[PDB]
Amino acid sequence: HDLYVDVLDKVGALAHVTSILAREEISITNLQILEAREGLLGVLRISFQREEDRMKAKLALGEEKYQTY
Amino acid sequence: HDLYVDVLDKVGALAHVTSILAREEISITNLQILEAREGLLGVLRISFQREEDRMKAKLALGEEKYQTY
Ligand SMILES: [Ca+2]
Numbered sequence: 001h002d003l004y005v006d007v008l009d010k011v012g013a014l015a016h017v018t019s020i021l022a023r024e025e026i027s028i029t030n031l032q033i034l035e036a037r038e039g040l041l042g043v044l045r046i047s048f049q050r051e052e053d054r055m056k057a058k059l060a061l062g063e064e065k066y067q068t069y
Numbered sequence: 070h071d072l073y074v075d076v077l078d079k080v081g082a083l084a085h086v087t088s089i090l091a092r093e094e095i096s097i098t099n100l101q102i103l104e105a106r107e108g109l110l111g112v113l114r115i116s117f118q119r120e121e122d123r124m125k126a127k128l129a130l131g132e133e134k135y136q137t138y
């Protein structure tokens with residue numbers, strides 16, 4: 001169960017995204033930071049144990065205006 | 070280049086750890102959440118691109134009283 005989140009600032013977005021997951025009490029298994037080029041832009045790939053956790057994350061991140069897949 | 074951090078609250082500690090990394094402007098490549106039992110205790114395994122980033126992270130987390138390896 002994976003969710004991919006496009007981000008403009010890998011470092012700051014990582015902190016914001018994990019604070020959102022914490023507030024919603026969503027457990028994750030892994031967080032991978034992907035990039036096509038060196039620089040601050042990237043994709044956060046978040047892995048979950050359960051489908052329910054992925055959907056909860058998708059909703060919460062969507063509400064904070066992150067584009068998610 | 071990996072750093073292992075013991076935590077008491079996987080969900081909240083993940084947010085705290087990434088906020089510290091943000092404060093120090095440290096980029097990471099991966100974060101894996103490991104647990105021995107279902108429940109809040111665990112170990113965060115953090116991967117870095119460079120040795121300098123690992124050491125910077127180790128120092129900053131140490132200063133916030135996390136036990137690190
Ligand atoms: Ca609660």
Ligand SMILES: [Ca+2]
Pocket residue numbers: 091092093094
């Ligand atoms: Ca700062």
